[PDB]
Design a protein around this ligand. Structure first.
Ligand SMILES: O=C(N[C@H]1c2ccccc2C[C@H]1O)[C@H](CCc1ccccc1)[C@@H](O)[C@H](O)[C@@H](CCc1ccccc1)C(=O)N[C@H]1c2ccccc2C[C@H]1O
Lengths: 99, 99
């Protein structure tokens, strides 16, 4: 699909059998979701944004469906203000910026 | 042009006769640039992202060139680690997300 930017590019994603809303963010290197439970062990990671850094839990090889597109990659979990789909997953679904 | 997301989507912008590098960020509501001098009156504003909030100076009706495309809009200036071109200006150049 083609998404304009007059409003936030929010889409529905499916993870752990649940539907959630997430932001398609080309300015995010990684994908970070709000506190939730995921399977397996996690590794520590620090990510920095415009206001500073936050500690997040990194889970690998996680299945996530974005607008019907299945992706499997690294997902970070932590105190993010909203669910963010970053470049690591955007590339998997073949998302590009056009103008 | 078409921009893939294997790397950060950085482009050259022209503002105040100065050339700079900035991130095309669909996850950013506004446009924020590192500390610089701009003409006119400004208003204080607080913007939040990953890490928390930062205080910036808001300037309206600023002209900016993004990849040869002219755009007019509100520009925020503050302690951002990277120059960010947000949705308020991406819409003006006809930028869309496609997959
Ligand atoms: O921090 C970022 N990337 C980092 C990131 C994010 C997730 C995972 C990893 C990493 C690493 C970085 O790339 C970039 C900036 C570039 C940047 C790159 C590198 C270093 C520092 C900054 C950014 O797109 C953020 O992902 C979004 C998150 C979405 C959000 C929406 C609404 C309220 C709060 C948050 C954000 O903070 N948005 C807000 C914003 C930004 C600028 C001006 C105004 C406003 C208002 C908000 O909309």
């Amino acid at each position: 699909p083609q998404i304009t930017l007059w409003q936030r590019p929010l889409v529905t994603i499916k993870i752990g059998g649940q539907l959630k809303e997430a932001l398609l963010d080309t300015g995010a290197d990684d994908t970070v979701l709000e506190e939730m439970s995921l399977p397996g062990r996690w590794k520590p990671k620090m990510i920095g944004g415009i206001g500073g850094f936050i500690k997040v839990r990194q889970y690998d090889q996680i299945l996530i469906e974005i607008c019907g597109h299945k992706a499997i990659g690294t997902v970070l979990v932590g105190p993010t203000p909203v669910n963010i789909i970053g470049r690591n997953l955007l590339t998997q679904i073949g998302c590009t910026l056009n103008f």
